[PDB]
Amino acid sequence: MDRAAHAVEQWRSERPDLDPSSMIVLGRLQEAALVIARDRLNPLFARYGLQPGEFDVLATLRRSGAPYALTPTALYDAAMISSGSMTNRIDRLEKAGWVERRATLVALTSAGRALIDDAVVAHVDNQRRVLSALSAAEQRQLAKLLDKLLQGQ
Amino acid sequence: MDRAAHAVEQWRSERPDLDPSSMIVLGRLQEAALVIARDRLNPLFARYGLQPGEFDVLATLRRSGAPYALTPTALYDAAMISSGSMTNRIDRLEKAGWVERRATLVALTSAGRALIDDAVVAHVDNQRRVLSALSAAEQRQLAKLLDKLLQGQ
Numbered sequence A, B: 001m002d003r004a005a006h007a008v009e010q011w012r013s014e015r016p017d018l019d020p021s022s023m024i025v026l027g028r029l030q031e032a033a034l035v036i037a038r039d040r041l042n043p044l045f046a047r048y049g050l051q052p053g054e055f056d057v058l059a060t061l062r063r064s065g066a067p068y069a070l071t072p073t074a075l076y077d078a079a080m081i082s083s084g085s086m087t088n089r090i091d092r093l094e095k096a097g098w099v100e101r102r103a104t105l106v107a108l109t110s111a112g113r114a115l116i117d118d119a120v121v122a123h124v125d126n127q128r129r130v131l132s133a134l135s136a137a138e139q140r141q142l143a144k145l146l147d148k149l150l151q152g153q
């Protein structure tokens, strides 16, 4: 029994008037996102000098194609994750030398392009090791259920 | 196409040397956790005066049973989510009048017990509305895949 199943068990015993079934799927969803970010993905980003969220900025710029420059709005719309503090992240990346602000565009530098080209290869190998417990069918199955849940919001 | 599928499409076109398939399931996992916390669960907690993470503390204490008092270590082990800043959350909850520090235990006050008894009922109704796009079988299916992924870590 994991955190979520144990908690549901305690709730059934303590508040029998309650149907706490929904707590398992949502508790596991949030714990999986947290543990994977904290223990797997972010330590790899930090090996590359990237704080959480900064990889996404560079990745979005890189995969938009040459000249790897987007408006801050397009950067938010094309991000993998709709996380905030985008102005702070661009500022940090600029002082680090990986993006520059042109005209108003945010663009990879040569150094930033080189970094993300390196980091994305390490990132996808890391992701496959994160998902290796699930078979290919289970991974597609999990992607489909997550897409339905997301659209339901 | 969602954020994740669109990003994978751009990657296949820009770095054909890369297999970016893993990005869909993990991108959807993190976006679903984020959107559900930000747009669904946390606004409900804030209706009750609870910041993100504080509900979990009260919920853990309440479901441990009378006298609703745990060591800070037990509080971390029994939490639904292994999130940090537990000392800060206990401090906040203490100044708010919902927990007290006894002997070293953290315990619900009368006011804190009443609050969590009210909030947990609202919380589970909110969770069912969050999950309503998925059928009962899909929800169990999603809980099983998430459990396998978590154990794989």
Ligand SMILES: O=c1[nH]c(=O)c2nc[nH]c2[nH]1
Binding pocket: A055, A056, A057, A059, A060, A063, A079, A080, A081, B007, B023, B027
């Ligand atoms: O293109 C991307 N792929 C990812 O896996 C990712 N994670 C955060 N930001 C990201 N961008």
Ligand SMILES: O=c1[nH]c(=O)c2nc[nH]c2[nH]1
Binding pocket: A007, A023, A027, B055, B056, B057, B059, B060, B063, B079, B080, B081
């Ligand atoms: O018992 C609990 N049930 C939940 O759904 C939850 N979410 C955060 N913390 C929680 N504790």
